[PDB]
């Protein structure tokens, strides 16, 4: 067994981290106080769930996780939440005042004062690791902490842990649920600095999750709580192969191998189905074909875009529940003949399939109904470049007038870093297009 350390940065990262660890506990039969009645090896062991949990002699299973925010409100809700006993104080790191949606403040000003402390608390987790794979890093693009401190953390992790893999779960900014206006700056800045330090990054657009919540969960005005429970389900689907017995995506390294042939283009599109309201008094359970076909509807993607007008480089199907290989292949054959699925010529047209017999666990009192089978598709399509196009355009609109730039310069950042970041993004969009058309 090889361990994985989770790092949650800023408000978005922390609250999503909480939703995920809550879900993890329910899935592995771990109680809020850290006890796991089914774990017969008291005080240790190297089972698959031990990738994410370590054990105390008293029998408590604790998350290999560190929480970091430059302001205490959100992490304090972990300290006093229902899973307060799960973590120990040294996993929760808080600052005094936040980065105020300012990357430069997250990266340079405040980030410099706390980076050594964070790395120290991370080191203490790594010391209890017999064989560390690397890190899963959760954060927003838009926050000053989420963008600024994360990119600095990623740089140092590449230094202190050179051969370890680093994966991102990144919240892409959406105006519907944000009161910020400078997020296009922070996103481009943090993507430029982190790009070489990240092996695989799963982007989640709040716009997509928002509409999925409205359309399929019938929630009129989705809150962060609604958004995070759904996001945690997707994240769980992606990490389940690291926490359970299996042969697909059992290592962080395998995520790059299976999903990322070209290093810079390491942003796989996630699609999830089915999403069913728990208030839906009568639901006809969906078949393998129906949920697999739904993986090619844009309305179910974590980022709204059109894969028909792009090219695939890789594609994984991760099923949970009552699913057998025969019905998957039968579904794929029909979907192939009915849909536009184009691979790049230097890649085989195919699917790597993983099946876990345990159906998705839902949070009691949540919005999601229990289903007999669910699927998460991870596809590396060039169509996700539409998201960079949107972002870079908003960046260009503001930066031409140098709007809000003084806030960044005032924290010690140089104006040229804006243009350097934007040029790197310009290169990225062109990489996607060469591969894509």
């Amino acid at each position: 067994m090889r361990e994985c350390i989770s790092i949650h940065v800023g408000q978005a990262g922390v609250q999503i981290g909480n939703a995920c660890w809550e879900l993890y506990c329910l899935e592995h039969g771990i109680q809020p106080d850290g006890q796991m009645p089914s774990d017969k090896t008291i005080g240790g062991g190297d089972d698959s769930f031990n990738t994410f949990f370590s054990e105390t002699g008293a029998g408590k299973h604790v998350p290999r996780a560190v929480f970091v925010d430059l302001e205490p409100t959100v992490i304090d809700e972990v300290r006093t939440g229902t899973y307060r006993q799960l973590f120990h104080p040294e996993q929760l790191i808080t600052g005094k005042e936040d980065a105020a949606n300012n990357y430069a403040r997250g990266h340079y000003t405040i980030g410099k004062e706390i980076i050594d402390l964070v790395l120290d608390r991370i080191r203490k987790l790594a010391d209890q690791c017999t064989g560390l794979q690397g890190f899963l890093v959760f954060h927003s693009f838009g926050g000053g902490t989420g963008s600024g401190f994360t990119s600095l953390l990623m740089e140092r992790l590449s230094v202190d842990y050179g051969k370890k893999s680093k994966l991102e779960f990144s919240i892409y900014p959406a105006p519907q649920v944000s009161t910020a206006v400078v997020e296009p700056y922070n996103s481009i800045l943090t993507t430029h600095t982190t790009l070489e330090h990240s092996d695989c990054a799963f982007m989640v657009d709040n716009e997509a999750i928002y509409d999925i919540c409205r359309r399929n969960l019938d929630i009129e005005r989705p809150t962060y709580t609604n958004l995070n429970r759904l996001i945690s389900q997707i994240v769980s689907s992606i990490t389940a192969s690291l926490r359970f017995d299996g042969a697909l995506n059992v290592d962080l390294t395998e995520f790059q191998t299976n999903l990322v042939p070209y290093p810079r283009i390491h942003f796989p599109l996630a699609t999830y189905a089915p999403v069913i309201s728990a208030e839906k008094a009568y639901h006809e359970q969906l078949s393998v074909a129906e949920i697999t076909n739904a993986c090619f509807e844009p309305a179910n993607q974590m980022v709204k875009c059109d894969p028909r007008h792009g090219k695939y480089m890789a594609c994984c199907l991760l099923y949970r529940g009552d699913v057998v290989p025969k019905d998957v292949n039968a579904a794929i054959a029909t979907i192939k003949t009915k849909r536009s699925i184009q691979f790049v010529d230097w890649c085989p047209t195919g699917f790597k399939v993983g099946i876990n017999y345990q159906p998705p666990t839902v949070v009691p009192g949540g919005d999601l109904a229990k289903v007999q089978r669910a699927v998460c598709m991870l596809s590396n399509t060039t169509a996700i470049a539409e998201a960079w196009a949107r972002l870079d355009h908003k960046f260009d609109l503001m930066y031409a007038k140098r709007a809000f730039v003084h806030w960044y310069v005032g924290e010690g950042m140089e104006e040229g870093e804006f243009s350097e970041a934007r040029e790197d993004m310009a290169a990225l969009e062109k990489d996607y297009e060469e591969v894509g058309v």
Binding site: E155, V159, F244, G350
Partner: protein
């Protein structure tokens, strides 16, 4: 069409089906960037304090 590398266990199974074959900065430089920005802040603050002194 062709199902390969099928692996089974009690928790589930995995396989691969093919439809068709084909056709870093150092600690030194990091700490220098962080300290260059801190200087620019301290320079900007000194220009403000000098201005207020006037």
């Amino acid at each position: 069409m062709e199902v390969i590398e099928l692996n089974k266990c009690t928790s589930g199974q995995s396989f691969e089906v093919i439809l068709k074959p084909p056709s870093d900065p150092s600690l030194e430089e990091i700490q220098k960037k962080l300290e260059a920005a801190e200087e620019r802040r301290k320079y900007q603050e000194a220009e403000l304090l000098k201005h207020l002194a006037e």
